[PDB]
Amino acid sequence: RQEWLLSELRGKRPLLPPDLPQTDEIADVIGAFHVLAELPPDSFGPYIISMATAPSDVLAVELLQRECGVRQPLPVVPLFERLADLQSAPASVERLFSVDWYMDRIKGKQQVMVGYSDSGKDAGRLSAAWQLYRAQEEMAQVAKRYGVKLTLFHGRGGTVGRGGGPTHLAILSQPPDTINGSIRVTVQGEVIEFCFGEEHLCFQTLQRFTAATLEHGMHPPVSPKPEWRKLMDEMAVVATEEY
Amino acid sequence: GMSYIHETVWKGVPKFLRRVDTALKNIGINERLPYNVSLIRFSSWMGGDRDGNPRVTPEVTRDVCLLARMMAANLYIDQIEELMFELSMWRCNDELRVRAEELHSSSGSKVTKYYIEFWKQIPPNEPYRVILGHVRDKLYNTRERARHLLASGVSEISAESSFTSIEEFLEPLELCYKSLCDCGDKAIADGSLLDLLRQVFTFGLSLVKLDIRQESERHTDVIDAITTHLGIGSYREWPEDKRQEWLLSELRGKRPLLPPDLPQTDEIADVIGAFHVLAELPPDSFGPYIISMATAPSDVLAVELLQRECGVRQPLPVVPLFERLADLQSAPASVERLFSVDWYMDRIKGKQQVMVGYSDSGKDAGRLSAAWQLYRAQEEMAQVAKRYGVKLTLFHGRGGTVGRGGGPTHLAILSQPPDTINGSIRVTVQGEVIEFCFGEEHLCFQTLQRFTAATLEHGMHPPVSPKPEWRKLMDEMAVVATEEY
C-alpha cells in the first residue's frame, strides 16, 4: 500500500476513472472530496481519519484529495482510538515522518487526534487511561526526534467513561512536555450547554483552559517513577483481563 | 454552401423522391420508396476541415455547427406550422388517441398570443393538430435554444425542453403516419406528411453532417507531448510496432492519460479543443474524422485514443486520406495492416471507409499515370476489404476540372472499377461546382437524378474488368507517362 500510493502520489498521470462504478457509499465519500474543492481554504480544519491504523491510511487521503482536485489539501490527521492502534501509533507516526515526500509536505507541523470514547470501550478504563498516557508520551518523543511540532487533538467526552472531568485536572493528568504550544479539545453537545451556557460560565471556561495549559508548560507534572511505571503496566493487563 | 440547402436542395429532395416513386410504379413496383431509406445525403467540410487552415479554430466549428442546427429547426417549423393546417382529420389510431389526450391535459396553457397560427389550445377533437402542435412548440425552443447558445453563453431553455435527437423528432411524426394509414386515410398520409418524414431522414436536425480533417503529424505532436510529460519516452521517435503496442494497451486500458497539468501549445491545444467540441455538440451533427497524410495504422489509432481520452460519447469513425502518388500505391498495404488489429477490426464492426484524393495524385506524376493508379488502388483496396469481410466505402475527392479528377458525373462513376460501389459512395462538391450543380431548380434535379442512376447501374450492371492484355500495356504506359512528366 505505501509503496504504490507513494509512487502514485509522485506521478503526473491521472487515476480516478470517469466510468468508475459507484456505491451509494463510494459516492458519499468522493463527492465530499469535491465539496472541499469548491469552498474556500480558510473555512476548513483538518481531515480526520477515524480508526486510523497504518501509515497508508493517511497517504490514501493525501492521494484521494489531490485526485479530486483541491487547492489547499486539508491536513490529514490519524485518529488512534482502539487500544491496538494506540500501542502501534508511535510507530505509524514515525513511519510517516520517514517518507521524504510526506516530511516535505508536512512543513514541520503535525497533528494527531486520540480518542477516549471507544478507547475505553475495548480495554478497561484503567488500561485505556494508562495506554493513552504512554501513547502521547512516545508520540511526542518520536516527533521531537524529527523536530516536528506535534500537537494533539483530545477527543474528550462528557462523562468520565468517555474521558470526562474537570478541565484543569484533565490537562494536568497528561504527560509532561506534550502540550506546551497547542492542544485541541472536543466539547460534546451536552458539555457545550455546560461550558458555554452562561456568560460567567464561558469566561471561566476560557480562563480554565488558558491557565491550565500555561502551567503544564512552565510547571509540568512529575514523571512517573520507574517502580510506578512497571506496576502500572502490570495492573494494566490485569485490568483488561478482568474486563 | 448553406445557401443552396435552404433554397433549392431543401424542397428539392422531397420532389426528387416523388419522381423516384412514380418511376418505381412504372416498373411494376406498386410501392413507394420507404421514407426511412435515404438515397442521397449531404455532408459538409465548411467548419470541419482544419488541415493547413488555422482560421478554422475549435470555436468556428461550434458556431457553424450550432447555427446550422438553428436553421434546420427554423425550416421544420414552417413545415409543421402548415402541416398542422393540413392534417385536420379526427378519425385516428386507437394509439394516437391516447398520446393525444395526454398532451391535452398536460398543456392546459393557451395564452400563447404571439403565435400567428394555432394560438389558443387545440381541442383533442383534432388528434393530429394536437401532437403536431406539441412537436412545433418543442421545435421553437430548439430554434431559440440555439439562438441564445449562439448569442450569449447559454440559454434559459432546458435540454429536455428541446429536440436533441432524431428519434425524439420521429416518434411523433411516424405516429401520425401509422395512425393515418391505419384509420384508412393513407393517401392523405403519403402527402405532405411523407415529404416531411423524408426530409428528417435526409437532413436530420442539423442540415448536413460535418466532416473533420487534420494531418496526423499534429495528432503525433499531441500524443508525444502527453508521453514526454508523463515521463515515458517520445512517442515521435517510437517505431510503428512500438506505437501500436502502447496505443493498443491504452485503448484497452481504463486509466486516464491526459494530464491536467499538460503544457499546452497554440496547436497542441487547438487540436484538443476540436475534440472537446465534438463532445459538446450532439453525436449526430458530425461525419467522419479524416486524417490527412496519415500513413501507418498507428496514425488511425492515435485518433481513436484522443477521441475517447478527450471524452467523446459516440466517437466518430476515422478515415484515411490517400492522395499523394506514393500513398495511393502503398494504400492497400496500410489498409490491410489496419484490419489486422483485433481491437480496431472489432470496434469497426464490418463497416469501413477510406478517402481517395484526385488532385495531388497526378500533380507529382502524369494525369494518365495517376488516373490508372487511383483505379488500381481502389480496385485492390476493395478486396483487402472483401477478404476481411468489411463493407468498405470510398470517399472520392473529385474536383471541378478534369485535371483534379473532375468531369461528367455518370462518366466518372462508370470509370470506376466494377464492384467497388455497391450502393455506398461519398463524393466532394468543390466550391465552384456547388453553384453549377444546385444553382437552379432543374439543375439540382439533374445532379440527384444523375448520381443515383449511375450508382444504381454501376452495381447491377458493372463495367467490364480490364483484359490482361490491357492491364499490362496500361501499367507499362503509366511508367512512360510519369517518366515523361
Side-chain angles (χ1 to χ4, degrees), chain B residues 221-485:
Chain B
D221 284 353
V222 175
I223 298 298
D224 175 71
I226 294 167
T227 57
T228 300
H229 181 70
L230 276 41
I232 47 176
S234 178
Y235 179 80
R236 307 195 61 65
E237 312 165 4
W238 282 15
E240 169 60 8
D241 41 302
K242 172 50 198 168
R243 303 187 176 190
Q244 281 190 46
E245 182 57 299
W246 189 71
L247 298 179
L248 266 154
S249 71
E250 302 302 344
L251 297 179
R252 295 181 174 297
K254 215 72 66 61
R255 188 188 183 198
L257 301 67
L258 203 46
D261 51 306
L262 176 60
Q264 290 300 58
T265 290
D266 291 298
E267 303 88 303
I268 303 287
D270 226 73
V271 38
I272 309 180
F275 288 104
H276 285 304
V277 181
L278 294 178
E280 283 171 38
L281 307 172
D284 56 345
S285 43
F286 299 94
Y289 181 106
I290 299 161
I291 321 177
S292 303
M293 198 194 86
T295 59
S298 98
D299 285 349
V300 184
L301 297 171
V303 181
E304 286 287 45
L305 189 58
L306 281 179
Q307 281 202 56
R308 267 154 286 256
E309 184 65 10
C310 269
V312 171
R313 19 274 248 160
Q314 305 306 302
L316 29 70
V318 179
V319 45
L321 186 52
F322 296 129
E323 193 147 56
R324 210 68 211 216
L325 178 59
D327 305 294
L328 279 163
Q329 316 227 70
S330 36
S334 320
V335 169
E336 189 161 64
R337 299 183 67 186
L338 192 70
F339 288 67
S340 303
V341 162
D342 321 61
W343 187 81
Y344 194 66
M345 188 68 262
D346 204 81
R347 96 85 164 176
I348 283 308
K349 186 183 179 178
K351 307 191 173 191
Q352 169 62 71
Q353 157 188 173
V354 53
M355 184 173 208
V356 204
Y358 292 60
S359 303
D360 256 312
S361 339
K363 217 258 296 173
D364 45 355
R367 179 63 229 156
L368 185 53
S369 340
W372 175 228
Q373 192 49 58
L374 290 158
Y375 180 93
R376 291 222 50 57
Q378 61 165 298
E379 177 174 63
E380 298 178 46
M381 211 136 77
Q383 297 162 187
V384 191
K386 189 140 166 60
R387 187 187 307 115
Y388 293 59
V390 328
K391 208 223 179 192
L392 181 163
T393 96
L394 299 156
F395 185 12
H396 301 280
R398 285 219 173 72
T401 61
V402 294
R404 301 197 298 97
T409 298
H410 54 133
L411 301 190
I413 292 184
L414 178 69
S415 67
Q416 298 187 183
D419 252 24
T420 71
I421 295 194
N422 308 94
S424 187
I425 177 177
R426 276 175 74 80
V427 191
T428 51
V429 185
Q430 324 262 291
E432 182 164 66
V433 182
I434 300 172
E435 223 310 71
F436 298 170
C437 293
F438 312 86
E440 200 70 11
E441 177 77 344
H442 46 91
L443 298 190
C444 157
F445 186 92
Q446 241 56 83
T447 312
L448 304 183
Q449 191 87 344
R450 191 79 83 195
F451 269 100
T452 36
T455 314
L456 178 61
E457 243 185 302
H458 182 91
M460 299 176 82
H461 186 190
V464 180
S465 181
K467 290 205 186 68
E469 316 137 58
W470 311 345
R471 268 230 181 57
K472 194 194 196 74
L473 194 49
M474 262 279 66
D475 293 304
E476 289 187 53
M477 288 196 281
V479 178
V480 190
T482 309
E483 200 194 74
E484 166 84 290
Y485 191 117

